[PDB]
Amino acid sequence: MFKAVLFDLDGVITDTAEYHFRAWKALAEEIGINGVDRQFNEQLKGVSREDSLQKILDLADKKVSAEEFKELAKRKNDNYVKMIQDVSPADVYPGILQLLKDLRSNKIKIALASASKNGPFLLERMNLTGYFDAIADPAEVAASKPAPDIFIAAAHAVGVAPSESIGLEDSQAGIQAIKDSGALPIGVGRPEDLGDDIVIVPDTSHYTLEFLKEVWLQK
Ligand SMILES: [Mg+2]
Protein backbone atom coordinates (compact mmCIF):
# COMPACT_ATOMS: atom_id res chain seq x y z
CA MET A 1 0.00 0.00 0.00
CA PHE A 2 1.05 3.69 0.10
CA LYS A 3 2.73 4.65 3.39
CA ALA A 4 2.10 8.47 3.46
CA VAL A 5 -0.12 11.27 2.15
CA LEU A 6 1.50 14.72 1.43
CA PHE A 7 -1.05 17.59 1.64
CA ASP A 8 -0.96 21.11 0.15
CA LEU A 9 -2.79 23.61 2.39
CA ASP A 10 -4.53 26.27 0.21
CA GLY A 11 -7.21 24.69 -1.95
CA VAL A 12 -6.99 21.25 -0.35
CA ILE A 13 -7.41 21.65 3.42
CA THR A 14 -8.94 25.17 3.41
CA ASP A 15 -8.47 28.59 1.77
CA THR A 16 -7.95 32.16 3.01
CA ALA A 17 -8.94 33.84 -0.34
CA GLU A 18 -11.52 36.24 1.11
CA TYR A 19 -8.89 37.51 3.61
CA HIS A 20 -6.14 38.02 0.98
CA PHE A 21 -8.72 39.96 -1.12
CA ARG A 22 -9.89 42.25 1.65
CA ALA A 23 -6.22 42.98 2.51
CA TRP A 24 -5.21 43.94 -1.05
CA LYS A 25 -8.44 46.04 -1.47
CA ALA A 26 -7.75 47.85 1.77
CA LEU A 27 -4.15 48.52 0.68
CA ALA A 28 -5.29 49.88 -2.72
CA GLU A 29 -7.91 52.12 -1.01
CA GLU A 30 -5.26 53.50 1.38
CA ILE A 31 -2.91 54.42 -1.46
CA GLY A 32 -5.66 55.65 -3.86
CA ILE A 33 -5.55 53.02 -6.62
CA ASN A 34 -8.92 52.27 -8.21
CA GLY A 35 -9.82 48.90 -9.71
CA VAL A 36 -9.09 46.26 -7.01
CA ASP A 37 -12.46 44.48 -7.09
CA ARG A 38 -13.38 40.78 -6.87
CA GLN A 39 -13.00 40.23 -10.63
CA PHE A 40 -9.51 41.81 -10.72
CA ASN A 41 -8.54 39.72 -7.62
CA GLU A 42 -8.83 36.57 -9.76
CA GLN A 43 -5.53 37.71 -11.42
CA LEU A 44 -3.85 37.50 -7.96
CA LYS A 45 -4.76 33.87 -7.04
CA GLY A 46 -1.57 31.70 -7.18
CA VAL A 47 0.70 34.78 -7.63
CA SER A 48 3.55 35.80 -5.28
CA ARG A 49 3.12 38.74 -2.84
CA GLU A 50 5.63 40.88 -4.80
CA ASP A 51 4.09 40.10 -8.26
CA SER A 52 0.60 40.81 -6.83
CA LEU A 53 1.74 44.21 -5.57
CA GLN A 54 3.35 45.11 -8.90
CA LYS A 55 0.09 44.23 -10.74
CA ILE A 56 -1.79 46.63 -8.41
CA LEU A 57 0.81 49.43 -8.92
CA ASP A 58 0.51 48.88 -12.73
CA LEU A 59 -3.24 49.77 -12.51
CA ALA A 60 -2.08 53.40 -11.96
CA ASP A 61 1.30 53.21 -13.77
CA LYS A 62 2.67 53.97 -10.23
CA LYS A 63 6.48 53.98 -9.65
CA VAL A 64 8.01 53.39 -6.16
CA SER A 65 11.42 52.87 -4.51
CA ALA A 66 12.65 49.56 -3.12
CA GLU A 67 12.00 50.80 0.44
CA GLU A 68 8.43 51.95 -0.35
CA PHE A 69 7.73 48.64 -2.18
CA LYS A 70 8.86 46.68 0.95
CA GLU A 71 6.68 48.79 3.25
CA LEU A 72 3.53 48.36 1.10
CA ALA A 73 4.06 44.53 1.01
CA LYS A 74 4.55 44.53 4.81
CA ARG A 75 1.28 46.52 5.42
CA LYS A 76 -0.75 44.07 3.33
CA ASN A 77 0.75 41.09 5.17
CA ASP A 78 0.05 42.71 8.57
CA ASN A 79 -3.62 43.17 7.67
CA TYR A 80 -3.84 39.56 6.28
CA VAL A 81 -2.38 38.13 9.57
CA LYS A 82 -4.90 40.20 11.69
CA MET A 83 -7.76 38.85 9.60
CA ILE A 84 -6.82 35.12 9.72
CA GLN A 85 -7.18 35.29 13.54
CA ASP A 86 -10.80 34.19 12.90
CA VAL A 87 -10.03 30.90 11.14
CA SER A 88 -11.76 27.99 12.93
CA PRO A 89 -12.64 24.30 12.50
CA ALA A 90 -15.64 25.40 10.44
CA ASP A 91 -13.28 26.39 7.63
CA VAL A 92 -11.95 22.84 6.99
CA TYR A 93 -13.01 21.65 3.50
CA PRO A 94 -15.60 18.83 3.11
CA GLY A 95 -14.20 15.29 3.53
CA ILE A 96 -10.78 16.37 4.85
CA LEU A 97 -11.27 15.68 8.56
CA GLN A 98 -12.71 12.16 7.87
CA LEU A 99 -9.78 11.42 5.53
CA LEU A 100 -7.29 12.44 8.25
CA LYS A 101 -9.04 10.22 10.86
CA ASP A 102 -9.09 7.24 8.47
CA LEU A 103 -5.44 7.62 7.46
CA ARG A 104 -4.35 7.84 11.14
CA SER A 105 -6.42 4.75 12.12
CA ASN A 106 -4.70 2.78 9.26
CA LYS A 107 -1.21 3.90 10.39
CA ILE A 108 -0.62 5.93 7.22
CA LYS A 109 1.73 8.95 7.74
CA ILE A 110 0.39 12.49 7.21
CA ALA A 111 2.62 15.51 6.23
CA LEU A 112 2.04 19.15 5.22
CA ALA A 113 3.87 20.25 2.00
CA SER A 114 2.86 23.93 1.86
CA ALA A 115 4.64 27.17 0.97
CA SER A 116 2.53 29.01 3.63
CA LYS A 117 4.55 30.78 6.33
CA ASN A 118 1.38 30.49 8.46
CA GLY A 119 0.94 26.71 8.09
CA PRO A 120 1.43 25.62 11.70
CA PHE A 121 -0.78 28.54 12.93
CA LEU A 122 -3.62 27.64 10.52
CA LEU A 123 -3.55 23.95 11.46
CA GLU A 124 -3.77 24.95 15.17
CA ARG A 125 -6.74 27.28 14.48
CA MET A 126 -8.56 24.44 12.59
CA ASN A 127 -7.76 21.90 15.42
CA LEU A 128 -5.81 19.63 12.99
CA THR A 129 -2.26 19.59 14.52
CA GLY A 130 -2.76 16.17 16.23
CA TYR A 131 -3.25 14.44 12.82
CA PHE A 132 0.02 15.74 11.30
CA ASP A 133 3.21 13.71 11.73
CA ALA A 134 5.30 16.52 10.15
CA ILE A 135 5.17 19.97 8.54
CA ALA A 136 7.81 20.71 5.88
CA ASP A 137 9.35 24.13 6.67
CA PRO A 138 9.23 26.24 3.49
CA ALA A 139 12.04 28.47 4.84
CA GLU A 140 14.43 25.47 4.59
CA VAL A 141 13.79 24.55 0.91
CA ALA A 142 15.88 25.87 -2.02
CA ALA A 143 13.14 26.24 -4.67
CA SER A 144 9.36 26.67 -4.84
CA LYS A 145 6.70 24.71 -6.77
CA PRO A 146 6.87 23.47 -9.55
CA ALA A 147 10.26 22.32 -8.15
CA PRO A 148 9.74 19.06 -6.13
CA ASP A 149 11.82 20.19 -3.07
CA ILE A 150 8.87 20.71 -0.60
CA PHE A 151 7.28 17.33 -1.40
CA ILE A 152 10.64 15.51 -1.07
CA ALA A 153 11.14 17.25 2.33
CA ALA A 154 7.61 16.32 3.55
CA ALA A 155 8.07 12.61 2.70
CA HIS A 156 11.56 12.50 4.24
CA ALA A 157 10.28 14.20 7.44
CA VAL A 158 7.86 11.27 8.06
CA GLY A 159 10.55 8.66 7.26
CA VAL A 160 9.42 7.54 3.80
CA ALA A 161 10.61 7.88 0.21
CA PRO A 162 8.40 9.98 -2.10
CA SER A 163 7.79 6.77 -4.18
CA GLU A 164 5.86 5.40 -1.16
CA SER A 165 3.53 8.47 -1.07
CA ILE A 166 0.44 10.11 -2.56
CA GLY A 167 0.40 13.95 -3.00
CA LEU A 168 -2.81 16.07 -3.05
CA GLU A 169 -2.88 19.45 -4.90
CA ASP A 170 -5.19 21.98 -6.63
CA SER A 171 -2.65 23.73 -8.94
CA GLN A 172 -0.76 22.78 -12.07
CA ALA A 173 2.57 23.83 -10.51
CA GLY A 174 1.85 21.62 -7.48
CA ILE A 175 0.96 18.63 -9.61
CA GLN A 176 4.29 19.04 -11.52
CA ALA A 177 6.18 19.26 -8.18
CA ILE A 178 4.52 15.99 -7.02
CA LYS A 179 5.36 14.20 -10.30
CA ASP A 180 9.00 15.25 -10.16
CA SER A 181 9.32 14.16 -6.56
CA GLY A 182 8.38 10.54 -7.47
CA ALA A 183 5.11 10.59 -5.50
CA LEU A 184 1.70 9.84 -7.08
CA PRO A 185 -0.46 12.94 -7.69
CA ILE A 186 -4.27 13.15 -7.27
CA GLY A 187 -5.62 16.60 -8.21
CA VAL A 188 -8.71 18.53 -7.18
CA GLY A 189 -10.16 20.82 -9.90
CA ARG A 190 -10.46 20.41 -13.71
CA PRO A 191 -8.06 19.11 -16.39
CA GLU A 192 -8.05 22.46 -18.26
CA ASP A 193 -5.98 23.75 -15.28
CA LEU A 194 -4.27 20.58 -13.96
CA GLY A 195 -3.51 18.35 -16.99
CA ASP A 196 -5.27 15.22 -18.32
CA ASP A 197 -2.47 12.67 -17.59
CA ILE A 198 -3.26 12.42 -13.83
CA VAL A 199 -6.30 11.37 -11.79
CA ILE A 200 -8.51 14.35 -10.88
CA VAL A 201 -11.57 14.77 -8.59
CA PRO A 202 -14.10 17.67 -8.85
CA ASP A 203 -14.05 18.59 -5.10
CA THR A 204 -12.49 17.40 -1.82
CA SER A 205 -15.57 15.36 -0.79
CA HIS A 206 -14.24 12.78 -3.27
CA TYR A 207 -10.91 12.35 -1.40
CA THR A 208 -11.70 9.20 0.67
CA LEU A 209 -9.38 6.46 1.90
CA GLU A 210 -11.16 3.91 -0.38
CA PHE A 211 -10.71 6.17 -3.45
CA LEU A 212 -6.99 6.68 -2.70
CA LYS A 213 -6.58 2.89 -2.32
CA GLU A 214 -8.31 2.27 -5.72
CA VAL A 215 -6.01 4.82 -7.43
CA TRP A 216 -2.88 3.28 -5.87
CA LEU A 217 -4.05 -0.18 -7.00
CA GLN A 218 -4.52 0.84 -10.64
CA LYS A 219 -1.00 2.28 -10.71
MG1 LIG B 1 -2.93 24.83 -3.37
Numbering used by the authors: 1 to 219
The authors write:
For complete catabolism of both trehalose and maltose, the isomerisation of βG1P to G6P is catalysed by β-phosphoglucomutase (βPGM, EC 5.4.2.6, 25 kDa). βPGM-deficient L. lactis is unable to grow or has impaired growth, when the sole carbon source is trehalose or maltose, respectively. βPGM is a monomeric magnesium-dependent phosphoryl transfer enzyme of the haloacid dehalogenase (HAD) superfamily. The active site is located in the cleft between the α/β core domain (M1–D15, S88–K216) and the α-helical cap domain (T16–V87), with closure of the cleft through domain reorientation occurring during catalysis. Two phosphate group binding sites are present, a proximal site adjacent to the carboxylate nucleophile and the catalytic Mg2+ ion, and a distal site located ~8 Å away in the closed enzyme.
Substrate-free βPGMWT exists in solution as two distinct conformers with near-equal populations, which differ in the isomerisation state of the K145–P146 peptide bond and interconvert at a rate between 0.003 s−1 and 1.0 s−1. Conformer A contains the cis-isomer of this peptide bond, as observed in the crystal structures of substrate-free βPGMWT, whereas conformer B contains the trans-isomer, as mimicked by the βPGMP146A variant. In βPGMWT, the ε-amino group of K145 is coordinated by the carbonyl oxygen atom of A113, the carboxylate sidechain of E169, and a water molecule that is replaced in the transition state analogue (TSA) complex (PDB 2WF529) by a fluoride ion that mimics an oxygen atom of the transferring phosphoryl group. An electrostatic relationship also exists between the ε-amino group and the carboxylate group of D8. Thus, the multi-second exchange between conformer A and conformer B in solution involves cis–trans proline isomerisation of the K145–P146 peptide bond.
